[PDB]
Design a protein around this nucleic acid. Structure first.
Length: 111
DNA sequence: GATTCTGCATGGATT
DNA sequence: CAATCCATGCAGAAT
């Protein structure tokens, strides 16, 4: 917890983000600019640690095809929301470690 | 059949 | 006017 952080993206949780589908949508602009570059629909597996804790979480960061561009999504978020009790309007903020791109990325509104 | 997963399409609101 | 973003609907696989 001697961490130095840079914000990569932030999302206001909507109904489907905390819904039964178990996936979280991320803003396309910031996801493309700051999140690792995705060159396949298969996506990648990313893990992000809580800023306030030593709890680490593993998600699948992938994209869907939409129109001629993309929609970015973070799959397998069911237990994350359930465990953290995230409701509509809560904030999921994703950060970055400065020397290493280790994805600290926690909710709990924060800011 | 009925139900859930998964990836894409639709459609309102905004850039 | 047309393009973009994204919440959600929804068709086809999988269970």
């Amino acid at each position: 917890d001697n961490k130095k952080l840079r914000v990569l993206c932030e999302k206001e949780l909507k109904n489907s983000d905390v819904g039964s589908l178990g996936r979280i949508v991320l803003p396309k602009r910031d996801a493309e600019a700051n999140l690792p570059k995705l060159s396949d629909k298969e996506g990648i597996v990313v893990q992000m640690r809580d800023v306030f804790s030593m709890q680490s979480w593993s998600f699948k960061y992938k994209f869907w095809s939409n129109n001629k561009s993309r929609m970015y999504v973070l799959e397998n978020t069911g237990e994350f929301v359930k465990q953290n009790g995230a409701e509509i309007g809560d904030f999921l903020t994703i950060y970055e470690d400065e020397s290493k791109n280790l994805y600290f990325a926690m909710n709990g509104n924060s800011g």
